[PDB]
C-alpha cells in the first residue's frame, strides 16, 4: 500500500515508479545498486545488482 505516480497501491501492491503491482519481499542486506530486476521488473528477494539497472 503506497501512493505512486498517477496511481495508488493498495493492500498487497508494490509501487513500480508509476504503476502498482509486483510485491517487494526481500532479505535485509544492502544492494550497492539495489535488488536485481530483470525481465519482469521491480526487484528480487535476495540478489543485488552487481551493475545497475
Amino acid at each position: 500500500t503506497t501512493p505512486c505516480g498517477p496511481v495508488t497501491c493498495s493492500g498487497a501492491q508494490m509501487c513500480e515508479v508509476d504503476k502498482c503491482v509486483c510485491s517487494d519481499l526481500h532479505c535485509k542486506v544492502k544492494c550497492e545498486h539495489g535488488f536485481k530486476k530483470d525481465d519482469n521488473g521491480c526487484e528480487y528477494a535476495c540478489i543485488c545488482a552487481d551493475a545497475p539497472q
Binding site: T2, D24, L25, H26, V29, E32, C46
Partner: protein
C-alpha cells in the same frame, strides 16, 4: 532500523560491520576470534570492522580485521532463507576494550513477550531510502510463533522468530541483515528478512539462534 533511536557511543560493543568496499551487513562478536552473521550476507572476501559507531568516519577506536574462514550453515536454503546463519573466523584475535566486547549465546530460547534490542546501520526510512552514519537502536518484543506464522503464511520455519510490531512503524531494514537481536544479554536473533520495512502485520523475521548453539560451538571447536 526504521523508527529507532541513535545508540549511545560504544553502547553496542558486540555489534560489527561486514565490509567489502563498504558496509553491506552487520554481525555479532561471540568471542575474540569469531563473528556470527546471516548466511545470505556471504561473500568470498570480507573485512570485519569492530568498535565502530559512525561508519562514515574513522574515529580512532575501530579495529579492521579480515575474515580468515567463512562458514555458512550446511542446510542454508537460499529460497526460504531457512538456517540463515554464518560464522566468520577473524584472521587475528580482536582486542577487547569497552568499545569492543562479545555477546553471550542463548542458554535457552526467549519466550514471546521478551523485550529485545535490535541494532544496525540499515535504512531508516520505511517509505524512502535513508542510511544513517550513527548506529541505530530499537527495542522490540519477540512475537509468538502463531502470530508470526499468520503474518507470513507458509514461510516461517521452526528456525525463525518474528520480532517487532504488528502495527508496523518500527522495524529492521536493508543493511541490518546479519545484525544482533539481544534479549537479557543473550543473542537471540539475527536480522534475516521480512516484507518491506515497518509494514503493518509484516514484522521482521529473524534467525532463531538458540537452535544453533551446538552447531556454533562444534564448528568453532573444529576451526
Amino acid at each position: 532500523i526504521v523508527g529507532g533511536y541513535t545508540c549511545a557511543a560504544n553502547s553496542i560493543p558486540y555489534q560489527v560491520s561486514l565490509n567489502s568496499g563498504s558496509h553491506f551487513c552487520g554481525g555479532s562478536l561471540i568471542n575474540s576470534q569469531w563473528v556470527v552473521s546471516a548466511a545470505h550476507c556471504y561473500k568470498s572476501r570480507i573485512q570485519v570492522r569492530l568498535g565502530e559507531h559512525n561508519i562514515d568516519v574513522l574515529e580512532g577506536n575501530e579495529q579492521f580485521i579480515n575474515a580468515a574462514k567463512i562458514i555458512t550453515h550446511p542446510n542454508f536454503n537460499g529460497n526460504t532463507l531457512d538456517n540463515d546463519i554464518m560464522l566468520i573466523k577473524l584472521s587475528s584475535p580482536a582486542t577487547l576494550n569497552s568499545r569492543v566486547a562479545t555477546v553471550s549465546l542463548p542458554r535457552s530460547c526467549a519466550a514471546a513477550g521478551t523485550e529485545c534490542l535490535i541494532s544496525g546501520w540499515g535504512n531508516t526510512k520505511s517509505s524512502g531510502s535513508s542510511y544513517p552514519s550513527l548506529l541505530q537502536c530499537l527495542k522490540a518484543p519477540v512475537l509468538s510463533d502463531s502470530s508470526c506464522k499468520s503474518s507470513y503464511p507458509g514461510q516461517i520455519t521452526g528456525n525463525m522468530i518474528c520480532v517487532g510490531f504488528l502495527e508496523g512503524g518500527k522495524d529492521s531494514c536493508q543493511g541490518d541483515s546479519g545484525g544482533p537481536v539481544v534479549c537479557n544479554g543473550q543473542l537471540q536473533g539475527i536480522v534475516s528478512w521480512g516484507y518491506g520495512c515497518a509494514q503493518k502485520n509484516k514484522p521482521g523475521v529473524y534467525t532463531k539462534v538458540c537452535n544453533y548453539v551446538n552447531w556454533i560451538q562444534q564448528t568453532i571447536a573444529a576451526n
